[PDB]
Amino acid sequence: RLTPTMMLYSGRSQDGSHLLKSGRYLQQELPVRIAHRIKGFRSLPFIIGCNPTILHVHELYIRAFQKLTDFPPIKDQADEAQYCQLVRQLLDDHKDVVTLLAEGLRESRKHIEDEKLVRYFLDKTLTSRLGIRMLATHHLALHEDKPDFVGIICTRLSPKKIIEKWVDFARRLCEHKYGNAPRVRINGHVAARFPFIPMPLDYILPELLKNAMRATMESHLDTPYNVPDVVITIANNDVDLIIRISDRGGGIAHKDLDRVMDYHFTTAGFGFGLPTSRAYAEYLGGSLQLQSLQGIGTDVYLRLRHIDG
Amino acid sequence: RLTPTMMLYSGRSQDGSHLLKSGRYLQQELPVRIAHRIKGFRSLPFIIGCNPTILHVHELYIRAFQKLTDFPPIKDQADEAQYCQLVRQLLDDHKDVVTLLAEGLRESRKHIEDEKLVRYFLDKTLTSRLGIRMLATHHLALHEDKPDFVGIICTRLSPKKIIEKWVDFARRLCEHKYGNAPRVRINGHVAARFPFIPMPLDYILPELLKNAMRATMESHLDTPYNVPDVVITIANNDVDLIIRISDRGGGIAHKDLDRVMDYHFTTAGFGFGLPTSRAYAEYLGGSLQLQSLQGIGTDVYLRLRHIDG
Ligand SMILES: Nc1ncnc2c1ncn2[C@@H]1O[C@H](COP(=O)(O)OP(=O)(O)O)[C@@H](O)[C@H]1O
Ligand SMILES: Nc1ncnc2c1ncn2[C@@H]1O[C@H](COP(=O)(O)OP(=O)(O)O)[C@@H](O)[C@H]1O
Ligand SMILES: O=C(O)[C@@H](Cl)Cc1ccccc1
Ligand SMILES: O=C(O)[C@@H](Cl)Cc1ccccc1
Ligand SMILES: [K+]
Ligand SMILES: [K+]
Ligand SMILES: [Mg+2]
Ligand SMILES: [Mg+2]
């Protein structure tokens, strides 16, 4: 069952033939998708494309294409096993790509007149990248025998559990900077369990939690020891999963509202949290919507489609 | 200070000359706006325009134009006083217009192929009507000496007070039908007071409250004696007033979501509550936005711009 035009193999065999079919799928799929990313770099405005960090990333993708296309057609388990080593190397080599693009683009984008251009390039590049890393990680995970997982697909994911995971994480970060962190309540369908892919949530949830906690602390500088809770509601229905994250952090100002979804815009991280999360949600067939109550707080609505039966 | 291109006179004199200037303004303004509504009827699809209820309303507007244009130019207080009698008559004669349009259009709109057509006609007709009734009522109110009012403009409106007014009202209606009504909590800027025109709120608030209470009751048929509260948050900033109305009434279904803002669409009133409220909010420079958590509830966000300094 599929992410967009990308299928995650739920097949399984004892002879391990599902691993060869998966491996062969990747082998046919990855080079084409990397070619697309390279075409993306080739079409960047010249002046942005000449930035040395952008050039570095452009070269990384070329190298990846080279390694992928030089790898021989998979015929046996020894082949597949070796291909996995390559996939692991590329996953690691490219792990800082978002950060590098942010850096390379930060100034150089100001050099051009179409602001739509960079946004489009980042949405496209980052979401294609997520899709590639999902397929790749899924293949590697097929070798695992974690219970409740078929690759990266959790067969019985609890939204509440994964939210709490990221809450603990964001609270620790927040405490480190402010001395305290809002407490988080979670309500709604807290007992929901369903088949789901965690990975997008692992990107998005911490970004939105960090935003909500930061806003809460910075609007309560006089009582850091007593700040309004962040409240999270889970709604699980047959079509989608909805996670609403509500804070009393004072809201997103009218003057900032039309900018918060721009890559690089920050009123402080490096301003990628919101546009990246939205691009990811929409890529997967969901959405990310903001409701600002200026003077009071912000509600953020994450919607992700369910895995189709 | 103004609604769109319509100015509400805050002028005041002891000789009562502000009343003559206001009266003269109305006299120049109303006939033109009524002419526009008549042109709206003239352009309706023939088959809809021939509906007898639609024809009735079309005639009402013609009569109104006739009476308005036959009235002599205002020169003195006796004139103005008489013009007020006319305005009062028209206000009353036209008080059921929304209901009549709903009825006349209900079936006849199915006869045509552009669904955008009726929506546009209603948005335009209903909002122009609100604007006219606001100007008209404002003029009449200039004769009043209610404290805290300049015409229909409240100089120190409390959002909490007007919300409670409509809560009591909606709860009574709801209790009459279900035996109980959700309790309502109000939070946020509960002590806010500012200059504001109540009239749009008096339309919108009861519509949204009725929706929220109905949804809550119909999703709790087994425990009507114990239903989730409706929760209302007031956010007051320098740009707008935001009133969020949140229920745990189960949400607006995915299959219904794209229809709830259509005139006439109802899953039960007569399906005008939402599209009418949105048209009114947008006419006044605000908005009405819905966030559905299918399986849990709905958040409705009403935003109205503040009176400009
Ligand atoms: N929940 C929130 N409350 C208030 N402001 C927010 C919230 N979420 C985001 N923002 C604003 O949006 C801006 C952009 O957020 P983001 O894309 O995550 O980048 P960053 O957090 O690195 O600035 C933030 O700088 C902040 O001003
Ligand atoms: N808060 C809500 N919760 C659930 N459903 C709602 C809510 N508000 C509106 N709806 C749905 O939207 C439809 C249209 O609402 P409206 O325009 O007010 O007309 P009516 O209430 O007369 O049907 C309703 O019939 C109902 O199905
Ligand atoms: O940019 C990335 O992170 C990805 Cl596209 C690199 C990669 C390519 C192919 C296979 C696995 C990882
Ligand atoms: O349809 C209405 O309610 C309004 Cl437009 C009728 C009216 C016209 C002119 C003055 C006052 C009321
Ligand atoms: K941003
Ligand atoms: K409707
Ligand atoms: Mg952030
Ligand atoms: Mg209604």
Nearest to B294 among A237, A293, A297 (CB): A237
Distance (Å, rounded) from C-alpha B290 to C-alpha B211? 12
H-assigned helices in chain B: 17-43, 46-49, 52-70, 77-93, 97-108, 115-141, 159-178, 198-218, 254-257, 273-283
Cα distance between residue A42 and residue B212, in whole Å: 53
DSSP per-residue string spanning A25-43: HHHHHHHHHHHHHHHHHHH
What is the three-class DSSP state of A157?
A: strand
Quick one: which H or E segment has residue A93?
A: helix A77-93
CB B105, CB B265: distance < 8 Å: no
Task: Round to whole Å and give the CA distance between B165 and B163.
Answer: 5
The residue to which tokens 């949600």 are assigned: A281
How many angstroms is it from A56 CA to the middle of ligand 2? 54
Strands in A230-236's sheet, in edge-to-edge order, are A184-188, A230-236, A240-247, A297-305, A287-293
Residue of B163, B240, B151, B136 lying closest to B194 (CA atoms): B240
Residue type, A247: D
Find out whether B27 and B135 touch, Cβ atoms under 8 Å: no
Give strand ranges (E) for A106-215. Answer: 149-150, 153-157, 184-188, 194-196
Resolution (A): 2.1
Cα B181 to Cα B184, B201, B231, B233, distances in angstroms? 9, 21, 13, 19
Q: Which residues contact B247 (CB under 8 A, 6 or more apart)?
A: B182, B212, B213, B215, B216, B228, B230, B231, B297, B298
Q: Within 10 Å of residue B247's Cβ, how many Cβ atoms? A: 29
Which residues, in sequence order, are CB contacts of B15 under 8 Å at separation 6+?
none
Residue B290, classed as helix, strand or coil, is strand
Sheet arrangement for strand B240-247: B184-188, B230-236, B240-247, B297-305, B287-293
Domain residue spans of chain A: 1-155, 156-309
The count of other CB atoms within 10 Å of the CB of residue A25 is 17
Cβ–Cβ below 8 Å for A188 and B301:
no
Distance CA A269, CA A207 (A): 10
Q: Give me the residue label for tokens 């993306």.
A: A40
Task: Compute the distance between CA of residue A104 and CA of residue A297 in angstroms, rounded to an integer.
Answer: 33
Q: Which of A106, A230, A260 should be mutated for ligand 1, with most atoms under 8 A from CB?
A: A260
Coil, helix or strand at residue B286: coil
CA of A94 to the centre of ligand 3 (A): 6
Q: Scanning the structure block, which residue is given the tokens 């929409």?
A: A282
Cβ neighbours of residue B269 closer than 8 Å, sequence gap 6 or more: B210
Q: Do A240 and A306 contact (CB within 8 A), yes or no?
A: yes
Beta-strand relationship, B184-188 and B230-236: parallel
User: Which backbone phi and psi does B218 adopt, to 5 degrees?
Assistant: -70, -10
Six-digit token string for A48:
């942005």
**Closest ligand to B265 CA?**
6
* Second-level CATH architecture of A1-155: Up-down Bundle (1.20)
> How determined?
X-ray
The answer to whether B134 and B2 have CB atoms below 8 angstroms apart is: no
Establish whether A262 is an annotated binding residue. Answer: yes
Strand partners, B302: B243, B288
**Tell me, what DSSP letter sits at residue A110?**
G
Name residue B3's beta-bridge partners.
B6
| Structure tokens, A155 | 């067969």
Give the integer Cα–Cα distance in Å for A56 and A33.
19
Residues of A with Cβ-Cβ distance to B229 under 8 angstroms:
none
Which 3 state secondary structure label does DSSP give B101? helix
Give the fold, CATH level 3, of B156-309: Heat Shock Protein 90 (3.30.565)
Tokens 């966030």 belong to B291
Q: Which residues of B touch A188 (CB under 8 A)?
A: 293, 295-296
Cα–Cα distance for residue pair B41/B121, rounded to 1 Å:
9
The DSSP call for residue A291 is E
Cβ–Cβ under 8 Å, residues A153 and A134: no
